[PDB]
C-alpha cells in the first residue's frame, strides 16, 4: 500500500502503474482535440512531435502513458493562451483516471503573483514535464525538467550551432556580456537588477535597461547578436520565471552559460551533466562570479564550449528533440536494467540516437571505443541482398559470418558489431574488403564505402537534388558496398518513423540514401569514401522528404578520398 | 530540531557565504572536539572517520574559516543510540544555528518498529551522509548516500582474481529476512536448482542445508549475488559483495544506492523490483558476458576506491560535497568512475566537437630557418601563391645573421632552438598552422591547398606529407625508425604539415617529462615529439597526403617517458577524388 505517498511525494513506485507498460515499450496516447478549444502554436508543435514519434498509439487500451490534448502549456491567467475551466474539462474525461500514467507538459505555469508552481487544475498522480521547476517542488525520477522555448522555436530540425573558428585561446573579444531587463518593484529580478557592481565598461559589460537614463544610453550601443558572438561567457540569470529564452540562445552561440538561477533544475538534469557544459553559480556570490570565470583554465573553457555546442545540437535545437528527450527520460524510468548510462547522454552523439533496448553496454555501440580504452571489433558479418562475390568475401581474415528494408533489420543471427553490405553485382575484391574494414576500424562511427554520390541545391526550383556524376566532392556513401556498425540497423528499425520506411518499401528504393541521412544525423560527419573505383525523380522526392522530416540537411560534403599508402 | 526539513536544498538551506572562492578550490571540514555528553562511546569506525578527515587536506582547525562541519557524536548506527538527548547534544554544538552546514555520518538508520530510512533523531537542517536512503526521505542534491561499512573489508583480505567464469551464476547469501523473501528464493531454486544457491546458518560464517560456507569467500565463487534489504534498505552486505567482485542485484525498492550522484551504478549493479522474484534469473540471463565482466570490474574498483575503509567513504563524501559546491572546478566523470587500469588506456580528445571549418579563414604558415637564404626565398615565393594562405610569417632562428600579398611578418627569435616553431604566437589568427621547412622546395601550392582542404575535415588531427614509421625490434628489445617506402604510416614530419593551432599550446605548455627541453638541447627529433603528443592526446591516427643523434634513440626515449606507444599504425592516405 502506498496511499500516504501520493501528491507532492509521488514517485514511480507509488504513482505509476508498470503493468500497463508492457514489453512493447512506452506507448503514449494523445487525447482527441475537442472542437472549439484554445490551443497554442507551441502546443500544436509538441502534439505533432508526439504524433510523429514512434511512441504514438491511437488506442488508449494499448497505451502506457497519456498526454492531454488541451492547452496546458500556458497556465497564466493574464496570458491570452490561457484555457478556462481546464479542471472541469479534464475531470469530465473518463480516461483521466486521477492522472495515473499521465504526462502534463507545461511552460508558463503561474500568474503575476510569485509565479508559483500552481498549475491551476488538479493533476492527481500525473508526471509533470514542467519548465523552470524548482528543486523544492521537484519530484526526482518522477518529474522531468524541460527547456523554456518560444513560439518561433523550430518544430523540427533546428539551426546549427553558431560556433565556428575554434580559435586558441578560446576566449573571444569580450568575457562577460549581458543584455536584458530589470523587472522593477516585484518578485524576481534580484540579480539582473544588481548586475552593475560587476560592470566596468569592458569585457564585463552587463548592460541592463528599464537610475535608468545611463543604463538606457549604454544599452543602445552594441548589438545583442554582436555581443553574443563576441563573448566568452553569457549569464543566464533568473527573472519572473526560473528559466528564460537566453539559455538556448547562449547554448546555440556556444557562449558558455553561467547559471545565476538558484534552485533551477537545468533541462534534463536527470540525465545531462551540466558541469561539463556550463558554469553553475549561486546568485549569492555574484561579486565573486567574475573572478571564478577568470580562474577557469583554457582547456576547461574549450571543453565547455564544445560540450555546449554538442548539447545544443543534440537535445535543444528543436521542439521535437525536447519532446523526444522527455519521452526517453520517462521511458528509462521503467526498466532499470534497460536504461542508459550517465555517459550515453553526456557525450557524442547523444541519448536520442542511442537506444538502451538494443544494449545498455557502451561497448556495443561504435561511439565510445576511445572512452573505454577498447578497440573496434576485428570481425565483421557479411550481409548480401554473387558466388564470386561470396568467395571473395570469404577469403578474408575478418569475415566471421556470411548472411527493401529487410537488409536493415536487427537480426539476431549476427554476432559481430560490424556489418559489410553487398548487392548482386558489387565487384568487391578481398583486398578491397580488408582495406575497407581497416579504415572502418579507424573510423567506426562513420560509413566507409566505395560508391559515393552528392547532393546539390536546385536554386532554380528551391529544392534538393541527387547527383551521381563524378564531381569534385561527395556527401553520401551508398549502403550497398560499405562497412558500418550493426547498431545502425537497429536504429533504422527503431528510430525512423513508420512513414519513411513505408514509402521506402513502396517505391523499392532510397534505402541507402535514408541510411546515409540517419548516420550523418548521428555522427554529424561526412561519410568516408575509399579508393578511386567509381564504376531519378524518386530519389529527389526521397531527399526532399528526408530533409522535411529531419528539419534540416544532415549531409556534409567531403573532398578527400582515402587510399592505400603507396 | 524539527525532525529534518525534507524540503531543504543547497540553495535554500545550505550556507555558501562562509565558503567562498579559495584558489585551490578545496572545502574546509572542521571537526568538533570530543565531549563526554553525559552519550555512547565512540566506535572504532567513527574514530577512523575522524582520523581520515583530519589527515586529508579537507581538514581545518579554524572554526571561523570552515566550509563544512562534523560533530563528534557517533551516529553511525542509532539502533544502539537513545534517539534522544543526542539531538540535545547536536543542538548544543557551537555554531549550530539550525545545523545548516553540519554533516552527519550514519550507516544504519531507523529502529523498532517502523524502521525509518534517515536518522530518526531530530536534525532540522543537516547535511545527512547516510545509508539506507529512501526516494521519499532523500533530499536529492543535498543528502549523500553512503554505504554501510562491513568489517569484512578490513578483517578479511581475499585474492583479487580478475573477472571471468564462476562456478554458480546466481547466489543468495543472507541468513533470513522476512520469510516471504526466502519463500520466493526457494521457489527460484526449486526449478533450476544448479546455479541458484540459497544458504543460511547453522558474523564470519554462513551455512547451507548441511554444508558450511566461509564468509565472505563464498561470494567470490558466484558471479551474481542477490542482495535483499529486510529490515532496512541499507545493508552492510554491499561492501562484502563488492570486495568479492560480485555484481550487486539490489531488491530494495526506492533505495538510493550509495554514491549514486557521482558514480554510474547502472554499469555496476542491477536493480530489480521486489515484485519480479519469479523471473529475476531471466533478467540476469538478458545481460551478456561482456557487460557482466565490465560490471564486475566496476564493482571491484568501487570497493577499492569507496568501499574499502571509512577513509575512502569520508574522502568520497567530502569530494562529492566539494563537487556540488564547486561545479566549475569539480572532478570529472572519468575520475569518479574509471579504475586506473582503464583510466590509463582511455582517451579524452580535447577537440571532440565534430565541426568542419569554412573555406574562408585560411591557414597559417610558420617558417623557421637559420641560414638558407636561397632555399628560404624559393620556399616563400612558392608558398605565396596558394589562395588559402591567410598569412605567412617567418621565424629567424639565427642570432649572428640578421633579417635582410599576405602579411610577411618577421619576428627575430631571441634564442636558437627548435621549439620556437611551436610557440602559441598571438600573430596566428587562424586555427590551421602549416609547419614548413626550407628543404621542402619540392611542394607546389596545389598540394598545400589540398592539404588545407583535408585538414578542414579533421581539424584535430595531424595532416602532413612526409610519412614515417616506427617498428619494434624484439631482438634489440627497442623501437626503430623507418623512413623508407613502407606499407604503414605512424608519423608525419613537421617539415610539411597542417595541424591545429592548439597543438602549439600543447607542445610549449604541456609536455610529458622533459621532452621539450631535452629535444631542444639536442639538434633533431622534434618532428617525432609532436606526433607522439598528438597521438597521445587525441587517441587518433595521422593523415599522410600524397606520396612525399640517432632517431631510434629518441623514439625509444619518447616511448619510455610516455609509458606506452601512443602512435597508431594505419595503412590509409588521403588523396583527391579527382586525382588523375
Ligand atoms: C598517454 O600518455 C599518458 C601519460 O604519459 C599515459 O598514461 C600512462 O600510462 C602508463 C601505461 O599505459 C602508466 O604506467 C603504469 O604505471 C603504474 C604505476 O603508476 C604501473 O603499476 C602500471 O603497470 C603501468 O606501468 C602511467 O602511470 C600513465 N601515466 C603517466 C603519467 O605516465 C597513457 O597511457 C598514454 N596513452 C596512450 C594511448 O598512449
Ligand atoms: O537586447 C535584447 C533583449 C532581449 N532579447 C530577447 O529577449 C528574450 C529574453 O530577454 P528578456 O529579459 O526580455 O526575457 P526574460 O529573459 O526575462 O524572459 C530572448 O528571446 C532574447 O532573444 C533580445 O533578443 N535582445
Ligand atoms: C565582433 O565585433 C566586430 C567588430 O570588432 C564585428 O564586426 C563583428 O560582427 C562582431 N561579431 C562577430 C565577429 O561574430
Author numbering:
A (entry chain A): 89 to 298, 311 to 485, 497 to 514, 546 to 677, 698 to 728
B (entry chain B): 78 to 115, 123 to 286, 296 to 497, 506 to 649, 671 to 702
What sentences appear in the manuscript?
Heparan sulfates are complex polysaccharides that mediate the interaction with a broad range of protein ligands at the cell surface. A key step in heparan sulfate biosynthesis is catalyzed by the bi-functional glycosyltransferases EXT1 and EXT2, which generate the glycan backbone consisting of repeating N-acetylglucosamine and glucuronic acid units. EXT1 and EXT2 are predicted to share a common architecture with a N-terminal transmembrane helix anchoring the enzymes in the Golgi membrane, followed by the glucuronic acid transferase (GlcA-T) domain and the C-terminal N-acetylglucosamine transferase (GlcNAc-T) domain. Here, we present the cryo-electron microscopy structure of human EXT1-EXT2, which reveals the formation of a tightly packed hetero-dimeric complex harboring four glycosyltransferase domains.
Single-particle cryo-EM studies on EXT1-EXT2, in presence of both UDP-sugar donor substrates and divalent manganese ions, provided a three-dimensional EM reconstruction with an overall resolution of 2.8 Å. We de novo built an almost complete model of EXT1-EXT2, only lacking the presumably flexible N-terminal stem regions (residues 29-88 in EXT1, residues 47-77 in EXT2) connecting the catalytic Golgi-luminal domain to the transmembrane anchoring helices, as well as several short, surface-exposed loops. EXT1 and EXT2 form a tightly packed 1:1 hetero-dimeric complex with a total interaction surface of 3523 Å2, suggesting that EXT1-EXT2 complex formation is essential for protein stability. The N-terminal glycosyltransferase domains of EXT1 (residues 89-435) and EXT2 (residues 78-419), supposedly harboring GlcA-T activity, adopt a characteristic GT-B fold architecture. The C-terminal glycosyltransferase domains, formed by residues 479-728 in EXT1 and residues 455-702 in EXT2, feature a GT-A fold and potentially harbour GlcNAc-T activity. The GlcA-T and GlcNAc-T domain of EXT1 interact tightly with each other, while the two domains of EXT2 are only connected through a potentially flexible hinge region. When analyzing the GlcA-T active site of EXT1, we found an additional EM density that fits a UDP ligand. The UDP is bound by several charged residues (Arg280, Arg346, Glu349), through a pi-stacking interaction with Tyr324 and a hydrogen bond with Tyr319. Surprisingly, the active site of the EXT2 GlcA-T domain displayed a different topology, with an anti-parallel beta-sheet intruding into the donor substrate binding pocket.
